[PDB]
């Protein structure tokens, strides 16, 4: 539109017209055009045969069918509409992450009513502990779990050898105390932004708790918003209230990568896309297309206003503006005509 | 992450004195605002201090439109 407006105007610019006349005509025409669009806007909640989502579904239908996934629109529209329906009412994109899993046909790309990780990290026992938890409780630790690894820096002085023994014992008692708080909490799944001590992993393995460390913060926020639990930094103040719960927890291979699953939370306002695809470039392109879809459907939910596609809007504006041009005599008429002639480009 | 000028602005807005000592949330020099929340404009996280002040407040103008260069021009003119 921008380029074609300029293109149609340029021949008149060959004539020595002061640009301000042109821009005045442009402003007037645009204001009139916007008013016309708003007049011929279409709502549906006045109508009878609309489901609160059908407009959204068809909106995704329309917007999608130009990008790289066009032949899977009947599928992706359903996923994205159902997903964004969960976003209420924060409406912000940061909640639902996008997960570019390598490999697989994008027809196999997954929508999970929960949170997953493309990440983990290998410590000693991470493969030892059971990796199924049917009805688990989610504990969310920001604080690290390791032997004063990066806690407050302190020099210590000890005369009696036995006191030195007691000192090392007391450090390990710190970590054991934290772990006991974790277990006696009754949860079985622990996630941490900060790294996890191997020994704590061993204890979780022995007592059949699952754990993981170094989880990226954004996905942790997703998780806590999902299972309803609140992230914790003080292990001591722990109580069942801040403990997230999920319908079922898992961690299953997809394309060689080690992922983590927990989903089915009935009250979860944030989901995530596992996006299969054989091309790394598909990952970015599909992600861009999906981002467009999500943000446009968000706008649609915000504003129950729809118009026809396929350039029909532009044609209607062209006709309306051209007819209006007859009314105003003088130099403005030609500029309005050029406005319409550029506008018809779509 | 507010800069010194920024917190000065906020100080003037709520009329509450910034406190270098973390402890004393003193009643008299403590903030008072009509409404504060977070909103989305232009895919930009925005913190809003929406206010009503009879005694007088330092208000702000929100500039909306496509081209940031036009923002520079228009804000310069304003």
């Amino acid at each position: 539109l921008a380029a074609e407006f300029l293109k149609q105007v340029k021949p008149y610019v060959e004539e020595g017209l002061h640009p301000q006349i042109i821009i005045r005509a442009f402003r007037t025409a645009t204001q009139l055009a916007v008013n016309k669009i708003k007049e011929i806007a279409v709502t549906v909640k006045k109508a009878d045969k609309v489901e609160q989502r059908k407009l959204l579904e068809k909106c995704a239908m329309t917007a999608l069918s130009s990008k790289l996934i066009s032949q899977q629109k009947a599928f992706f529209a359903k996923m994205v509409v159902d997903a964004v329906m969960m976003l209420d009412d924060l409406l912000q994109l940061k909640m639902i992450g996008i997960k570019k899993v390598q490999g697989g046909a994008l027809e196999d790309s997954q929508l999970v009513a929960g949170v997953a990780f493309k990440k983990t990290f290998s410590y000693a026992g991470f493969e030892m502990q059971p990796k199924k938890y049917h009805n688990p409780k989610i504990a969310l630790l920001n604080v690290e779990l390791e032997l004063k690894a990066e806690k407050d820096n302190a020099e210590i002085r000890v005369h009696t050898v036995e006191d030195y023994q007691a000192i090392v014992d007391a450090e390990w008692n710190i970590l054991y105390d934290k772990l006991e708080k974790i277990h006696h909490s009754g949860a079985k799944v622990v996630l941490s932004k900060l790294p996890i001590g191997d020994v704590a992993t061993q204890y979780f393995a022995d007592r059949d708790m699952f754990c993981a460390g170094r989880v990226p913060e954004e996905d942790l926020k997703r998780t806590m918003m999902a299972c309803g639990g609140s992230i914790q930094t003080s292990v001591n103040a722990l109580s069942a209230d801040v403990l997230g719960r999920c319908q079922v927890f898992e961690e299953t291979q997809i394309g060689g990568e080690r992922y983590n699953f927990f989903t089915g939370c009935p009250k979860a306002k944030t989901c995530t896309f596992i996006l299969r695809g054989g091309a790394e470039q598909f990952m970015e392109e599909t992600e861009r297309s999906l981002h467009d879809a999500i943000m446009i459907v968000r706008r649609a939910i915000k504003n129950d206003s729809v118009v026809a596609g396929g350039g029909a809007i532009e044609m209607e504006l062209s006709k309306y503006l051209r007819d209006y041009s007859r009314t105003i005599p003088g130099k403005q008429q030609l500029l309005i005509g050029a406005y319409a002639k550029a506008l018809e480009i779509i | 992450l507010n800069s010194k000028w920024d917190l000065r602005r906020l100080c003037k807005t709520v009329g509450a004195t910034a406190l270098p000592r973390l402890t004393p949330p003193v009643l008299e020099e403590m903030g008072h605002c009509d409404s504060v929340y977070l909103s989305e404009v232009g895919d930009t996280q925005v913190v809003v201090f929406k206010h009503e002040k009879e005694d007088g407040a330092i208000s702000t103008i929100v500039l909306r439109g496509s081209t940031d260069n036009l923002m520079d021009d228009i804000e310069r003119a304003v």
């Binding site: 539109l1 921008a2 407006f5 821009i23 442009f26 916007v34 669009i37 706008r299 206003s305 | 036009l70």
Partner: peptide, 29 residues
């Protein structure tokens, strides 16, 4: 959604305004 086309037209209009409102350009090394 109407918003897409509405914002499109507004942006294009002011783009034309901006571009056409320029007569000359100055470059500095």
């Amino acid at each position: 959604p109407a918003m897409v086309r509405i914002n499109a037209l507004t942006a294009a209009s002011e783009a034309a305004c901006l571009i056409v409102s320029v007569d000359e350009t100055i470059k500095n090394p």
